[PDB]
UniProtKB/Swiss-Prot annotation, chain B:
Protein name: ADP-sugar pyrophosphatase
Motif Nudix box mapped to chain: 83-104
Tissue expression from the record: Widely expressed. Most abundant in liver.
Stretches assigned to the Nudix hydrolase domain: 43-183
Recorded name of the encoding gene: NUDT5
Cofactor: binding comment: Binds 3 Mg(2+) ions per subunit.
List of residues binding Mg(2+) 3: 98, 102, 152
Main location: nucleus
Keyword Transferase among UniProt keywords: yes
Induction: Overexpressed in cancer patients with a poor outcome.
Stored CDD domains: NUDIX_ADPRase_Nudt5
Binding site for substrate: 15, 33-34, 38, 70, 84, 119
Required co-factors: Mg(2+)
Length: 194, 194
């Protein structure tokens, strides 16, 4: 029933643009919306990846590896899954593995890859693949992992036990001014609810 | 260590604005970022998302989701019921109200997240994630009455919580929808738990 009629550019930056979207509602009436899109998306199946990195070590509880960074749009520090945009021609899996190593130091093994999922679909067209990766924390490669952050990237690694993730996130939010990402929080909630 | 120095308006619509953010990087170098903000925030957060756990005796426990046309996405998406928090509304009340408008179910609050970020590399958008149980054996949830506002056109999709990730993947494979990332994240953790 519903579909896009036209997309009119309002303002275009280097990284983001705003568009006036005209679409057909399901009663046959023309309506409009204000849409956000990234300027960087080309032939990629999604803008980005986020990595769910399960760190596995013998005689350790499995940890979820998370990153803490300053996010200018938020005016603050945020706790997120490791994540980055997919480079042109790069596979979501390769981007996941690369972004994980860059942000955390860890070399993971691919477990699973989602289809393209939407980040905030009432606002933007941004999509990611959510890539589950296991990290062999016994392997010497992953012993004393060093983040190789890029030009103007600055990341702290926080590994939390999967079996206590939600309380461990709550405890971090209690100590300081910082925001948890909605995907991380949804994942931690479902761990509790299972 | 890092912080905002100034924000320059680039373009302001009715619903969304685009800003150029200047910030101090942790080396003491001044850097810029393109940031999206909603023009509606008053409030703990912009919006709520509801995790609606439909509990009926002798049936699998279901998670209740909604399917809508999303003009920024140019297509249909599957999402937790959700909407913006009205001025002077609590997140808890916004959650029950949105859940009722979008699904017709009347539910009870189990828990409520702190404000969590939606896409912090792009926007300052936040939500409260509100876990709600629905007593599907209660008379008021027999024939649920979805009362959508002006311009919302919502389909309800309840899926068993214990097979949620496979059910979603099926829908994406069969019906060319986009699953929301918070929805997919929750679904993953339900598989990853234990
Ligand atoms: C349905 C109302 C509450 C709304 O959020 N409308 C809208 N139109 N463009 N953007 C972005 N958002
Ligand atoms: C670090 C690079 C890849 C980046 O995403 N820069 C940027 N600047 N404004 N937005 C939005 N995003
Ligand atoms: Cl529950
Ligand atoms: Mg990143
Ligand atoms: Mg990166
Ligand atoms: Mg809604
Ligand atoms: Mg509504």
């Amino acid at each position: 029933k519903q579909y896009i009629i036209s997309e009119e550019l309002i303002s275009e930056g280097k990284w983001v643009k705003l568009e006036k979207t005209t679409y057909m509602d399901p009663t046959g009436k023309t309506r409009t919306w204000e849409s956000v899109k990234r300027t960087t998306r080309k032939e990629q199946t999604a803008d980005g990846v986020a990595v769910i990195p399960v760190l596995q070590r013998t005689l350790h509880y499995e940890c979820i590896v998370l990153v803490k960074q300053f996010r200018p749009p938020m005016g603050g520090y945020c706790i997120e899954f490791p994540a980055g945009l997919i480079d042109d021609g790069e596979t979501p899996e390769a981007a996941a593995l690369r972004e994980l190593e860059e942000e955390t130091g860890y070399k993971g093994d691919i477990a699973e890859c989602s289809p393209a999922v939407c980040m905030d679909p009432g606002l933007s067209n941004c999509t990611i693949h959510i890539v589950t990766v296991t990290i062999n924390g016994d392997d010497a490669e992953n012993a004393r992992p060093k983040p190789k952050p890029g030009d103007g990237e600055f990341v702290e690694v926080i590994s939390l036990p999967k079996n206590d993730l939600l309380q461990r996130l709550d405890a971090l939010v209690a100590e300081e001014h910082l925001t948890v990402d909605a995907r991380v929080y949804s994942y931690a909630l479902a761990l509790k609810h299972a």
